[PDB]
């Protein structure tokens, strides 16, 4: 009798800023306040022909004539200064809490039904497991996407700032903690306790995340990449643009937010492929594949409908998955595609 | 007095005005609960004039809706990769595809028309089987305007359509352009019993249509294949 | 007590006899009004034994009926005449054929499988159109056992089927082998309202089926295509 | 005899300006005159399909094909600078008075009966209840809609401006006063009687409002949005713009005006769900449901027509409701 | 050089190696692995 609501929307928790980059030398890591920013420049590029060809091509005269006329591009690039070897990344984070309440609904009965559902969940299990996985993803520097790979050593400091000053501190080695599993540790447990306190509506939390990564001298870094639009260009324009706030290279905030929620180990495909980010029809774009296909009964919508309408509470890890998808926020209902 | 052209309605604005010395009236064109255009027309206008004042906006909306909800196209290529031999417009994907580039190991490949192609190699007999199974009716784009829960095959989730949804396909203003009499003859009923379905509200002597009659009617009009 | 296996009935003969000292009974197997076989079976036989006494005759009748009412086959040949590339089983002929022998003027021809062939030259896109339009369902041979006036598309000549005709497709003894419950779920009804259709006589609380439900049910079972 | 007028219109009172945004550091809030504005920008987003699919599980390959060609958009955004942790929002509010008189009418007897009814109401009680509720809604910073959520400490400040200088200042803590109930406090009552003095026609009043919210460095703020009609379909590149007056991020006036008149607690459904904004057929678009349906005799129109034409009063809370609806202003006629 | 009508480009050697398991001479395998160490975009 109790049907689902036609309009449903949840605002997101775990709001980060966008992180901007700076540069300096190692063992100046405790004086990194006047480290100058990393700027973006331009340079020219001449390329060859190095892709596949159609069958009406590859007549060698046409190929040689293609090699005769070259292509000339302009490209934005960003790299370290020529006397520094450490990259510094900094952003802040707000954990909001109150994750049960929708921001828009139609049925009151559906609303308080799922309210008492998430109340029963939060009475059985705390926010301890999800906050443990979140503090794990904060511990290793997963938000450095391509700047992490091939690095020598990487260290990350967290400051819990409550009034206008610091209240507690953490230090880690990011490559000690793997990107493959979730261990236990006392400092990590204190951090996860703080985060689960913030998620439960108990207190007010605000963090500052600083990461130091040792790359080498003059080496290249990777900010986020913008989108260029041009309508019938003249083949001399730029072909790559980089995001920057007030002339300092930076990463988009949703890149950080996507790296933070990489906590799904419960997808039914395999286990030697690593955790992925929480999504309805949980899909990564690099593989071009969709784990939790809806023809299996393990997507977000069928799990939610079986839990709410007909009270088939799933396995506890699936309940963790559904609560994580509710923490992420989104648009559900009859605005379907 | 309103005018009804399929799912569209044209109403006047209940108190006119004088523009240039002549009495006028404001008119509004609706698509369900959404208001689309407003014009100011004088009196001494017959209803045909008020029709073809808005006919062009109706036609443009039809053109855009046809282009947006067009079905997908598969194609048959030989072993080189170019020189498409035949095309087909499907309503579903054959579920076994995964991104491919054709080579010389097989003489026939079945690729998509979208750019990062998916593809499959076939042998001209299973191709005919897929063409028989997954093809699309000529008016499949009307299904893009329907709520989906009135389109499912499962009887447990289906609900009968309302009159406004039912005017998308039946009536002279609808997109199929078929009459109520012809649709009644297509179901083996009287004209009056079919007019019973499209009254407007079930309190005012109106009945819901059945599951089977609805799906069979969508089959016979060339909207959903309904195998 | 009779036994009913689809459209077949097995009755005993109301007064037994003693053969070899043991009491026996004569049984008769009917197909409508036509009597097919007669056996003499002893008592202390369960109904399963009386079933598989006649199961082989039932299976042979099914084999012959399947072979006799098989649909026609078209085929696609290249310009020489031999080396058929693909086959298709149609339910109708494409109406433009006239006796032909393929030559080198065209690379694709669409011939019949019967011996004085008829044929047509095609170009692999209209061939797919004909394959989509004129194909045949997997169980099209059951239509050979039906009176035709219960199969027409015109609503003026159609009459509803009786219970004996309706047992050809629904029921565990029928040729499709589908249950009444599954067929009721295929139409979005209850099991009881579907059992209302198959009572046996309209005086004994039985209703006729509708035109639309009958044709949609023949569509969903893979018997008639019903476009 | 004595029907309703065919055309009838009321001008609004409580006119706000637009809200201007600016940023700075907390504990410099007393010297906040040179605080720089907050500018909007553009950034790119690439996202995948995340809604319910129309056909549920009949096509996985369509899902993978939609994944391999994702959606690209351009989106406006407003952030704090990376070294300031406090938002500053400033606007002015003007109270007029002369609440009963419409600006358009047809029958003279109708409007005479109307304004003598309003004179009877204003003779029974003053504007003290409505002014108390308005000053309460001004005490907490409800006009910070999403920027209030999850803030650390928010403090407002109101000045009374008669000549080019300030008459009386107020200060509050907006998190002391909840969004749930209407208490009493002497500063709030002084503000409320100033509002009631303005509403009565006894004199003009002009106030300026400044709110500070401690959010965090580089976080996201929220101005109003605009219309991207017929522009996100051909390529879909630009898909979200924010409202800004002279390159500074801003909120529309009517959003603040909607935030001010959330005082209605007398709707018949419940009282544990907080006050809502006044409206004929008092409705909330965020829940898609209209309280005070016309079936029950508790909407605005039937209440007014009963009070004027059949000459009986409703309950005193309903008199508060109909008077607040007249303060809101609008068009009331035969449509 | 490595003109693709001669069967010695990177693409045809890679296709014959991975699909049909016709592994080429060891110097051509050096060439293919060096091309993979170079990196690039190998799609249609």
mmCIF file of N, CA and C in Angstrom, chain B residues 15 72 92-93 95 116 118 143-146 148, chain D residues 6-7 54 58-62 65 68 233 334:
data_model
loop_
_atom_site.group_PDB
_atom_site.id
_atom_site.type_symbol
_atom_site.label_atom_id
_atom_site.label_comp_id
_atom_site.label_asym_id
_atom_site.label_seq_id
_atom_site.Cartn_x
_atom_site.Cartn_y
_atom_site.Cartn_z
ATOM 1 N N UNK B 15 -11.044 38.401 -19.315
ATOM 2 C CA UNK B 15 -11.391 39.820 -19.402
ATOM 3 C C UNK B 15 -10.489 40.502 -20.415
ATOM 4 N N UNK B 72 18.210 4.074 -31.003
ATOM 5 C CA UNK B 72 19.601 3.859 -31.370
ATOM 6 C C UNK B 72 19.706 3.085 -32.676
ATOM 7 N N UNK B 92 16.677 -1.523 -28.056
ATOM 8 C CA UNK B 92 17.366 -2.112 -26.917
ATOM 9 C C UNK B 92 18.720 -2.592 -27.408
ATOM 10 N N UNK B 93 19.622 -2.812 -26.480
ATOM 11 C CA UNK B 93 20.927 -3.253 -26.926
ATOM 12 C C UNK B 93 21.083 -4.756 -26.729
ATOM 13 N N UNK B 95 23.105 -6.781 -25.484
ATOM 14 C CA UNK B 95 23.462 -7.263 -24.148
ATOM 15 C C UNK B 95 24.801 -8.007 -24.135
ATOM 16 N N UNK B 116 32.493 5.853 -29.353
ATOM 17 C CA UNK B 116 33.337 4.767 -28.838
ATOM 18 C C UNK B 116 32.619 3.443 -28.987
ATOM 19 N N UNK B 118 31.015 -0.360 -29.711
ATOM 20 C CA UNK B 118 31.008 -1.552 -28.880
ATOM 21 C C UNK B 118 31.114 -2.831 -29.696
ATOM 22 N N UNK B 143 7.240 7.159 -26.785
ATOM 23 C CA UNK B 143 7.490 6.556 -25.484
ATOM 24 C C UNK B 143 8.396 7.402 -24.610
ATOM 25 N N UNK B 144 9.125 8.353 -25.191
ATOM 26 C CA UNK B 144 9.913 9.266 -24.386
ATOM 27 C C UNK B 144 9.086 10.238 -23.575
ATOM 28 N N UNK B 145 7.828 10.444 -23.948
ATOM 29 C CA UNK B 145 6.946 11.355 -23.240
ATOM 30 C C UNK B 145 6.040 10.646 -22.253
ATOM 31 N N UNK B 146 6.282 9.405 -21.979
ATOM 32 C CA UNK B 146 5.358 8.699 -21.121
ATOM 33 C C UNK B 146 6.029 8.325 -19.808
ATOM 34 N N UNK B 148 6.576 5.829 -17.979
ATOM 35 C CA UNK B 148 7.316 4.599 -17.761
ATOM 36 C C UNK B 148 6.606 3.573 -16.915
ATOM 37 N N UNK D 6 -14.622 43.017 -8.253
ATOM 38 C CA UNK D 6 -14.063 42.191 -9.314
ATOM 39 C C UNK D 6 -12.556 42.360 -9.405
ATOM 40 N N UNK D 7 -12.065 43.591 -9.295
ATOM 41 C CA UNK D 7 -10.635 43.858 -9.256
ATOM 42 C C UNK D 7 -10.295 44.524 -7.930
ATOM 43 N N UNK D 54 14.777 4.760 -16.785
ATOM 44 C CA UNK D 54 13.373 4.633 -17.147
ATOM 45 C C UNK D 54 12.969 3.172 -17.261
ATOM 46 N N UNK D 58 16.418 -3.844 -18.175
ATOM 47 C CA UNK D 58 16.312 -4.496 -19.466
ATOM 48 C C UNK D 58 17.509 -4.227 -20.361
ATOM 49 N N UNK D 59 18.420 -3.353 -19.954
ATOM 50 C CA UNK D 59 19.542 -3.025 -20.820
ATOM 51 C C UNK D 59 20.758 -2.615 -20.005
ATOM 52 N N UNK D 60 21.700 -3.527 -19.766
ATOM 53 C CA UNK D 60 22.947 -3.105 -19.113
ATOM 54 C C UNK D 60 23.910 -2.429 -20.064
ATOM 55 N N UNK D 61 23.877 -2.810 -21.341
ATOM 56 C CA UNK D 61 24.836 -2.281 -22.298
ATOM 57 C C UNK D 61 24.596 -0.805 -22.557
ATOM 58 N N UNK D 62 23.342 -0.363 -22.452
ATOM 59 C CA UNK D 62 23.048 1.061 -22.540
ATOM 60 C C UNK D 62 23.656 1.812 -21.369
ATOM 61 N N UNK D 65 27.339 2.101 -22.149
ATOM 62 C CA UNK D 65 27.540 3.066 -23.220
ATOM 63 C C UNK D 65 27.372 4.486 -22.716
ATOM 64 N N UNK D 68 30.625 5.335 -20.837
ATOM 65 C CA UNK D 68 31.815 5.611 -21.633
ATOM 66 C C UNK D 68 31.765 6.936 -22.378
ATOM 67 N N UNK D 233 20.608 22.423 -23.877
ATOM 68 C CA UNK D 233 20.093 21.316 -24.668
ATOM 69 C C UNK D 233 20.934 21.006 -25.897
ATOM 70 N N UNK D 334 -11.252 38.229 -9.490
ATOM 71 C CA UNK D 334 -11.914 37.099 -10.126
ATOM 72 C C UNK D 334 -11.089 36.625 -11.311
#
